[PDB]
């Protein structure tokens, strides 16, 4: 019976690839040949930040495009001001180890967590002097790798137990669990509408999850090694993915195929972070070769390079309005670029 | 209005003074990753220093340590181990007695030594429950030769300091398993990080000083290696 189901899986797995080969009447290599390249991007540091004691791991912009959060592996979560290069808050965490942080679109709360297995949510506009832990969301068996706000109350979490989970912060229990991944989950990417998200884990595959119903509608594969980061294309109907195989792959949700690959012979190091510009032409990919390469998402060409850091580029954000780009690194220095 | 931007600027002065206070305490504390296995007696050592994570702070000579055990998380440790690259020293504890799982401990040690992010971090090896290893060797039914035929043609090293009234057979076993770990360490580590092998047992009233002396050497060597002295 198990053997029969494996044979049916082989019959269906090849049938899935057979459907894509029928759909794949061309590749994006020769479709985008006609368009003129942007050419070089003159991208330079504008507002280099400084103040974290140990390596930063994650950062996140607000909707205002002004305040940014940062986590470092010392137990500090400083909320900066990009415009004035100043610290509005500096939040001492219970656990020193924190692998994630997220700013609410409303800006009311900021979430973070790590090896404690808790997406500890902090309220910025508390009537008291100092900020306090709003609610301890414990329950996951494994380290929390990312958590991101859907809305003021809804929070999506990734973990090292191969499971995503959405929580209700008022009651303090997880509403829906997302099971399916074989390896530990690294990153999340919410849609513009926050109706769907994709989620990469250490299995060289990506799965788009439904937030409400809680089942994987579609799966993507193509990567050779464990996934590191994902971000949606501004459309919401495609996304790129950085992995340890030192290549990024853009995946269309509709076409269900790797449309085109970001490969250079020279690059051998893994990819840590990926992000799009507001237009989505410039795929900002952060490598652990101590720099971040600006990929042409249409032409698969190195548009530009941002050599700013002496250590691994950890995290990389773009502002929602798309004025500026941030990079975090293991040197504890946030560089802002424009 | 311009008044607010001084108020936030003044707010940074109170922020920044608190960061400077936290800077001293951050450098004063030493981070330690405690690694091993369920049967390795990692927690048994922790009980001696009474002074899903388990941190243990112990004060020795007004030097605070932060020994971080990682128990709760899954066995897949290729992605969360990267977070412990700022740590001064990995406390790698091993079960000396269990010959089956020693070779797995050799792979786990070899998996750390050659990692890109863990190449700079020195490993303090603790051969735990040494007393139990000695007692099983004297039985003679459990032979290391079954798991490592290379053991047959291994003599005790000259730089051996056995305790009085010990059987020479145990020291060959005892110094082979160390030497097996150090074979990886020396073959792939050159200035950037060093293995510190140690014997230890349950009856030891120790491992707070012995760790302190090994961490002292790690920090001292960091200075010396700055101006090309090693």
């Amino acid at each position: 019976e198990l053997d029969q189901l494996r044979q049916e899986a082989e019959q269906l797995k090849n049938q899935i690839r057979d459907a894509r080969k029928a759909c794949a009447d061309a590749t994006l290599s020769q479709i985008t040949n006609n368009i003129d390249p942007v050419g070089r991007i003159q991208m330079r540091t504008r507002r280099t930040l400084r103040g974290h004691l140990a390596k930063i791991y994650a950062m996140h912009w607000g909707t205002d495009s002004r305040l940014l959060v940062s986590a470092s592996q010392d137990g500090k979560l400083i909320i900066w001001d990009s415009y004035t290069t100043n610290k509005v808050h500096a939040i001492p965490l219970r656990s020193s180890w924190v692998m994630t942080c997220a700013y609410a679109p409303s800006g009311n709360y900021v979430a973070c967590g790590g090896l404690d297995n808790i997406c500890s949510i902090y309220n910025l506009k508390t009537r008291e002097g100092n900020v306090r832990v709003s609610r301890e969301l414990a329950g996951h068996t494994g380290y929390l790798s990312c958590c991101r706000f859907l809305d003021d109350n809804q929070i999506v979490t990734s973990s090292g137990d191969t499971t995503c989970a959405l929580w209700d912060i008022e009651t303090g229990q997880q509403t829906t669990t997302f099971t399916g991944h074989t390896g530990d989950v690294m990153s999340l990417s919410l849609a513009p509408d926050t109706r769907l998200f994709v989620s990469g884990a250490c299995d060289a595959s990506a799965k788009l999850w439904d937030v409400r119903e809680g089942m994987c509608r579609q799966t993507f594969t193509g990567h050779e090694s464990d996934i590191n980061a994902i971000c949606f294309f501004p459309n919401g109907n495609a996304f790129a993915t950085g992995s340890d195989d030192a290549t990024c792959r853009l995946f269309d949700l509709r076409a269900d195929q790797e449309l085109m690959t970001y490969s250079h012979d020279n690059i051998i190091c893994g990819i840590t972070s990926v992000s799009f510009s507001k237009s989505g032409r410039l795929l900002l990919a952060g490598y652990d070769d101590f720099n971040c390469n600006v990929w042409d998402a249409l032409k698969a060409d190195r548009a530009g390079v941002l050599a700013g850091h002496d250590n691994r580029v950890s995290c990389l954000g773009v502002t929602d309005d798309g004025m500026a780009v941030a990079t975090g690194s293991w040197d504890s220095f946030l560089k802002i670029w424009n | 209005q311009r008044n607010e931007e001084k108020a936030q600027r003044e707010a940074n002065k109170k922020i920044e003074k608190q960061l400077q206070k936290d800077k001293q305490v951050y450098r004063a504390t030493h981070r330690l990753l405690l690694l091993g296995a369920d049967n390795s007696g990692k927690s048994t050592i922790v009980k001696q220093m009474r002074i899903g994570i388990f941190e243990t702070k112990f004060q020795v000579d007004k030097v605070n340590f932060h020994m971080f055990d990682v128990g709760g998380q899954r066995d897949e440790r290729r992605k969360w181990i990267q977070c412990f690259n700022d740590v001064t020293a990995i406390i790698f504890v091993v079960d000396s007695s269990d010959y089956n799982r020693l070779q797995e401990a050799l792979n786990l040690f070899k998996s750390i030594w050659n990692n890109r992010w863990l190449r700079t971090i020195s490993v303090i090896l603790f051969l735990n429950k040494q007393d139990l290893l000695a007692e099983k060797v004297l039985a003679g039914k459990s032979k290391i030769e079954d798991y490592f035929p290379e053991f047959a043609r291994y003599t005790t090293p000259e730089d051996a300091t056995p305790e009085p009234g010990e059987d020479p057979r145990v020291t060959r076993a005892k110094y082979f398993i160390r030497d097996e770990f150090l074979r990886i360490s020396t073959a792939s580590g050159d200035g950037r990080h060093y293995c510190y092998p140690h014997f230890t047992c349950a009856v030891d009233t120790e491992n707070a000083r012995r760790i302190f002396n090994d961490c002292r050497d790690i920090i001292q060597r960091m200075h010396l290696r700055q101006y090309e002295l090693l």
Partner: nanobody
Framework: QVQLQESGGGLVQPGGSLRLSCAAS????????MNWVRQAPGKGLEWVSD????????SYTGSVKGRFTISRDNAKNTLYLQMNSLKPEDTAVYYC?????????????????????RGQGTQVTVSS
């Protein structure tokens, strides 16, 4: 899409030989270091043997050194292993495992419970 398709294994007389072959797909074979792991009935996973990128630095668990011979063909993108004198203890399922990174000297958690880049494995049995 990454697959590892196993071959060989089955019933064989004690002291005999068996040529295992790992058919690798969905990555550049030459770029990754490979590994063998076996699972005994009612026991933990254990490491068997490794291969470098070029296929020079060979190592074994030590219990099976002499009795096993590991190889790779980078030209045909396939991995080999061959036994010499099978013991009753050697009865286990042999999984052909890859490594996470493309230019590393250390593979991490190949012997994990739920590792992703490991084969389904072939049950080798020794009987008369």
């Amino acid at each position: 899409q990454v697959q590892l398709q196993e071959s060989g294994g089955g019933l064989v007389q004690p002291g005999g030989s068996l040529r295992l072959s790992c058919a690798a797909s969905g990555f550049t074979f030459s770029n990754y270091k490979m590994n063998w792991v076996r699972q005994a009935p009612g026991k933990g996973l254990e490491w068997v043997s490794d291969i470098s990128q070029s296929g020079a630095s060979i190592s074994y668990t030590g219990s099976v050194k002499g009795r096993f011979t590991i190889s790779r063909d980078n030209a045909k993108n396939t991995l080999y292993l061959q036994m010499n004198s099978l013991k009753p203890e050697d009865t286990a399922v042999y999984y052909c495992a890859r490594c996470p990174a493309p230019f590393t000297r250390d593979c991490f958690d190949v012997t994990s419970t739920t590792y992703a880049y490991r084969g389904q494995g072939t049950q080798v049995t020794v009987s008369s």
